[PDB]
Amino acid sequence: AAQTNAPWGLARISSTSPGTSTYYYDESAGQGSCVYVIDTGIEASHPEFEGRAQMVKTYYYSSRDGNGHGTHCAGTVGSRTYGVAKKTQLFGVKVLDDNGSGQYSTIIAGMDFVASDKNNRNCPKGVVASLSLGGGYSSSVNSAAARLQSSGVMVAVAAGNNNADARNYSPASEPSVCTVGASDRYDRRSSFSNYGSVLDIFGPGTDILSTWIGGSTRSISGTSMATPHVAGLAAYLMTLGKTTAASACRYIADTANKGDLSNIPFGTVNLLAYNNYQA
């Protein structure tokens, strides 16, 4: 399938080259998979989600996304226009308040929530969790991420926006999950992107168009935007049968565009997420 005048990032992870604007992907489009978006919520009513988004948990007075961030990430995962995996099922877990902040205890609870809740969902093609959040190093946060992964969920987490080594942030620094840095439309490392040996992969993160609350759209930047590209890609590839929740990060690294990014510090992977789709 081909989506013309796609957002650049969608075009990028189906291309061996930057600078194109059509997204190509297998029409299965992640159908039968599920991706949890652990964030500020999701505006499920957005036309862009087509009935495939739902809130399943909140820790606050509402499960509505009063921020927009979680809605944007969800859109990159699976919205009809802005999403990688255009037929996945999207589940919102609001660990972050409408100001975009959250206690680590709450985030940890959300992670263990997802590890259990998947057993209450129909996801025959597999389960992904996307975590466009983080703060300073916490072993208990990492451990929760590792449990969720261990439980059979493909965990994708943002590297962070400090232009520093991701080793000092959680859950970025958890080795067993898939830590995602950010790149721009010219295949440069995003200016803010964290780096380091604990990065697994890069995805598009600068000037990423997606859904926003109030039925809207906007372009923003962050490793928060890169993470759901990889989360969606995982779900898409699991639906294709190509990989599993346990092996998808590795598979994505294996099949990445290699050596194409600039300003990747020595010791950091030079791998850009790529669906290897050939129509």
DSSP state string for 136-162? E--HHHHHHHHHHHHTTEEEEEE--SS
Q: What is the rounded CA–CA span in Å between residue 14 and residue 156?
A: 19
Q: How far apart are the first and last CA of the chain?
A: 7
Q: What are the residues facing 272 on neighbouring strands?
A: 202, 257
Tell whether 177 is in a known binding site. Answer: yes
Known binder of ligand: residue 155?
Answer: no
Structure tokens at 225: 């935007």
> By the 8 A CB rule, do 199 and 268 touch?
yes
User: What domain range is 162 assigned to?
Assistant: 1-279
Residue 66: count of CB within 10 angstroms of its CB: 18
Q: Tell me how the structure was determined.
A: X-ray
Q: Which of 14, 15, 33, 39 is catalytic?
A: 39
114 annotated to a ligand binding site: no
Contacts of 159 (CB under 8 A, 6+ apart): 166, 169, 172, 179, 180, 181, 182, 193, 194, 195, 196, 199, 223, 226
Separation of alpha carbons 59 and 3, rounded Å: 37
Tell me which of 46, 69, 72, 229 is the catalytic residue: 69
The neighbour count for residue 242, using CB atoms within 10 Å, is: 17
DSSP letter for each residue of 31-69:
TTEEEEEEES---TT-GGGTT-EEEEEESSS--S-SSSH
46 labelled catalytic: no
- Encoded tokens for 186: 């010219």
Listed by the residue before each break, gaps in the chain with C–N over 2.5 Å are: none
Distance CA 2, CA 221 (A): 25
Pair type for strands 33-39 and 126-131? parallel
Active site residue 229: no
Task: Work out how many domains the chain is built from and give that number.
Answer: 1
Neighbouring residues of 15: CB distance < 8 A, sequence distance ≥ 6: 274
| Residue 58 Cα to chain centre, angstroms | 19
Q: Do 153 and 118 touch, CB atoms closer than 8 A? A: yes
Helix 223-239 with 69-78: angle, nearest 10 deg = 30
How many C-beta atoms surround the C-beta of residue 220 within 10 A? 16
- 3-state secondary structure string across 177-205: CEEEEEECCCCEECCCCCECCCCCEEEEC
Q: What is the CATH number of the domain that holds 241?
A: 3.40.50.200
Q: Is 175 annotated as a binding residue?
A: yes
